[PDB]
Amino acid sequence: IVGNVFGFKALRALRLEDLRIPPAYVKTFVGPPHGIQVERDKLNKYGRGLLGCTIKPKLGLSAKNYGRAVYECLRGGLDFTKDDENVNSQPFMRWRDRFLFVAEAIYKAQAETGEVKGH
């Protein structure tokens, strides 16, 4: 649908505005791993919007400081924190180091608040 046609000399501009995905095609997709209802059931969270927070600065924090910031955020009443989109694995913070410190922070904040936490 968008592979080649946007580059045709015969047109000056092209924008795809909408697609009608028919049920017969929708049914061929696994789709979302859980979806809204299942997610709320899995988190045991109802009756309000969920609250989250991207850790900052975007880049430049160590794994230990990442987990530090995460714990302090979650313990105050956020349901979630998150890696910044561009936080993957980098010289200033390797991913597995982060994962481990973050898991400690989630567990500590969950135990302190009595509410289910994630990051």
Which positions from 27 through 66 interact with Mg ion, judged by CB under 5 A?
Answer: 54
Picked from Mg ion, other proteins, none, the partner binding residue 54 (CB below 5 to 8 A depending on kind) is: Mg ion
Residue 53 within binding range of other proteins, rule CB under 8 A? no
Which of 46, 41, 93, 99 lies closest to 70 in space, CA to CA? 99
Residue with tokens 């000056």: 12
Find the binder of other proteins among 22, 23, 32, 47 (CB under 8 A): 47
Q: Site for other proteins (CB under 8 A): which residue of 7, 19, 46, 57?
A: 46
82 contacts other proteins (rule: CB under 8 A)? no
Torsion angle of alpha carbons 67, 72, 73, 79, nearest 10°? 90
Residue 97's binding partner out of Mg ion, other proteins, none, with CB under 5 to 8 Å set by partner kind: none
Measured distance CA(110)–CA(105) in Å, rounded: 8
Q: Which two tokens stand for residue 76?
A: 């105050």
Is 82 a known ligand-binding residue? yes
Does 88 interact with Mg ion (rule: CB under 5 A)? no
Which residue stretch of 8-16, 21-29, 80-88, 103-111 sits at the interface with other proteins (rule: CB under 8 A)?
A: 103-111
User: Could you give the CA distance from residue 94 to residue 109 in angstroms, rounded to a whole number?
Assistant: 23
Report which residue type is found at 4.
N
Please answer whether residues 97 and 60 qualify as being in contact, where contact means their C-beta atoms are separated by less than 8 angstroms. Answer: no
67 vs 80, beta carbon nearer other proteins: 67
